Amino acid sequence: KIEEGKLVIWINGDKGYNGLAEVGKKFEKDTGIKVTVEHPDKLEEKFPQVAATGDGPDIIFWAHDRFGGYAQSGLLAEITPDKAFQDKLYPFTWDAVRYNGKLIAYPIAVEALSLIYNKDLLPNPPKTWEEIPALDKELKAKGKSALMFNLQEPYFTWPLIAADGGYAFKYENGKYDIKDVGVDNAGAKAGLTFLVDLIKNKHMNADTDYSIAEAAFNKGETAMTINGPWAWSNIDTSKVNYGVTVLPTFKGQPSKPFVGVLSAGINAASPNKELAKEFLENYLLTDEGLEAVNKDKPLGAVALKSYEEELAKDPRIAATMENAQKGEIMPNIPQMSAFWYAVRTAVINAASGRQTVDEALAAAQTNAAASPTGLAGSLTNALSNGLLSGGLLGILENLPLDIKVTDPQLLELGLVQSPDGHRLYVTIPLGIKLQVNLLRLAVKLDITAEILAVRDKQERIHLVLGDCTHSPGSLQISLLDLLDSLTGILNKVLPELVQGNVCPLVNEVLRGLDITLVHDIVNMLIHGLQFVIKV
Ligand SMILES: [Mg+2]
């Protein structure tokens, strides 16, 4: 049903689709190839539905955060722009479109929250959150407010909360580590505590939401609000004389708003991928293409350096790009769904006083990471937690020999499935510090173990530990702030002393697993199906 020899494009109705149509027109003129631009309602749920059947548009436009999901589900083609082309766009925008080290879409535009202020009430807006309480005091005396913005959505409260070391999921080269969330830290505790205080001191109301803050600002009741470029046109109407600027710092740290990147993906089912590439690279992403779209409906800041340079002559667009640069690319993976919820709850519970800052944050810090995985992730999670509660840290710390062993860690477990699918091998990295105190060392080494499915007498079928031993090359010693003497020794002592105090624990942990996880794993090993991801 996808036609070869033309291009169908889907983009949201609040974007500049007519302008984009004009781009398609120039394209047809040069190449003769026809371009159709549609804006179906709920295109973001429609694309995965139709694309999964091998139908849909050749190119889908949408915020980059969905694209991760689409990639996992095989819906998106890898895009192949040359480095010369890549130089044309800001690097961080290319990071918004990475999935597993690959480019999955073309960045188009960028948006982030900014501080929006009323120039008649507040000609010189504050550079720090801390000076807001004092400013609210003055203004109430003049019968007005310092600051009003939506506290109902964690999107709006996140810039403050995450200002010091906060993050959603840790980014590593196109990959997010879904087990590593940054919601809870001193930064987050301070930021959220500050917000809650502003509510206790009546500088804000806990029940303030988008509509209330928008009205209050657009009616000139409050001096400041926090919002994005989509809000601008309503203020243009309001006649309020406004400016848009960098978000205030908290404890000298920049605010850390989430960054959305409007992006263009190519349908993995499209017969037109090369034409799509040609259209996107040579037609749409140019001063001219972007101009067409922007004049139809404004893009805000854009990913194309040349055109962004023009737009940023507009100080609000410039401010938007500045807040983006200081901000956090929204993770492009579906687990964000748990994150939002975890965080939403926490904030609402904190501002209502239903929970303390620390408890809301601690719950959230746990729940954001709690999305269930398939067998491989479940197994490695289960094994790690098992070893930890089985007291493996103690076993390391209390390893015998002047010396003090410290900082025992379980590292990230590895997993390998036999090519035939019938066999399974676990790598358990372990670490400790040695104090020769003076002369501190970091030791790391692996224990590898086989996991086996075994029927015994007869229909009884179980999951048992194969050979549990040190990994031969694995031992690595590292100076911290003699050897090869020490290491020379540790090579012939350590691996055996570790593996002997451990393999038994590994053996108990295997048995302590959820019984259905065990049955499903066994069931797949028997029939030799691969649930394990090549790394
Ligand atoms: Mg950059």
Which class for 181: exposed (0-12), middle (13-18), buried (19 or more C-beta within 10 A)?
Answer: buried
Backbone angles phi, psi at 59, to 5 degrees: -135, 130
Amino acid at the residue 157: T
CA 314 to ligand 1 center in whole angstroms: 20
Q: 75: which 2 tokens?
A: 């819906």
CA 89 to ligand 1 center in whole angstroms: 8
Cβ 304 vs Cβ 285: under 8 Å: yes
- Which is nearest to 416 in space by CA: 428, 427, 408, 425? 425
- Record: fold of 112-258+335-368: D-Maltodextrin-Binding Protein; domain 2 (3.40.190)
Distance of alpha carbon 114 from alpha carbon 318, whole angstroms = 10
Residues 6+ apart with CB under 8 A from 314: none
Distance of alpha carbon 96 from alpha carbon 261, whole angstroms = 7
The H-assigned helical ranges of 201-243 are 210-218, 232-238
Cβ 77 vs Cβ 69: under 8 Å: no
CA 311 to ligand 1 center in whole angstroms: 17
3-state secondary structure of 470: strand
- Which is nearest to 517 in space by CA: 418, 379, 369, 372? 379
CA 305 to ligand 1 center in whole angstroms: 10
- Which is nearest to 392 in space by CA: 405, 409, 380? 409
Distance of alpha carbon 154 from alpha carbon 161, whole angstroms = 9
Which residues, in sequence order, are bridge partners of residue 38? 10
Task: Report the helix count and the strand count for the chain, using DSSP H and E.
Answer: 21, 21
Resolution in A: 2.5
Backbone angles phi, psi at 315, to 5 degrees: -60, -25
- Determined by X-ray
Distance of alpha carbon 395 from alpha carbon 121, whole angstroms = 64
- Dihedral over alpha carbons 113, 119, 123, 128 (to 10 degrees): -20
If you ran DSSP here, which 8-state letter would residue 283 be given? I
Cβ 280 vs Cβ 106: under 8 Å: yes
Strands in 222-227's sheet, in edge-to-edge order, are: 145-147, 222-227, 114-118, 242-245
Whether cis (ω within 30° of 0) applies to the bond prior to 484 is yes
CA 182 to ligand 1 center in whole angstroms: 22
- Which is nearest to 15 in space by CA: 264, 340, 310? 264
Label residue 42 left, alpha or beta by phi (over 0 means left) and psi (-120 to 50 means alpha). left
Distance of alpha carbon 136 from alpha carbon 127, whole angstroms = 15
Instruction: Return the half-sphere exposure (C-beta side, CA atoms, 13 A cut-off) of residue 147.
Output: 31
Helix-strand-coil percent breakdown of the chain, rounded to 5?
A: 40, 25, 35
Distance of alpha carbon 423 from alpha carbon 530, whole angstroms = 10
Which class for 14: exposed (0-12), middle (13-18), buried (19 or more C-beta within 10 A)?
Answer: exposed
- Which is nearest to 270 in space by CA: 517, 73, 2? 2
Nearest-5° Cα angle at 30, 29 to 36: 55
CA 96 to ligand 1 center in whole angstroms: 11
Residue 286: C-alpha distances to residues 50, 112, 279, 291 (Å): 30, 22, 11, 8
CA 385 to ligand 1 center in whole angstroms: 38
Length of the chain: 535
CA 302 to ligand 1 center in whole angstroms: 12
If you ran DSSP here, which 8-state letter would residue 90 be given? -
Cβ 323 vs Cβ 112: under 8 Å: yes
Distance of alpha carbon 77 from alpha carbon 266, whole angstroms = 6
CA 290 to ligand 1 center in whole angstroms: 19
- Which is nearest to 345 in space by CA: 332, 329, 331, 362? 362
Residues 6+ apart with CB under 8 A from 396: 405, 408, 430, 432, 498
Which residues, in sequence order, are bridge partners of residue 170? 177
CA 91 to ligand 1 center in whole angstroms: 4
CA dihedral over 164, 165, 169, 173, signed as positive or negative: positive
Distance of alpha carbon 132 from alpha carbon 222, whole angstroms = 12
CA 248 to ligand 1 center in whole angstroms: 21
Distance of alpha carbon 338 from alpha carbon 333, whole angstroms = 11
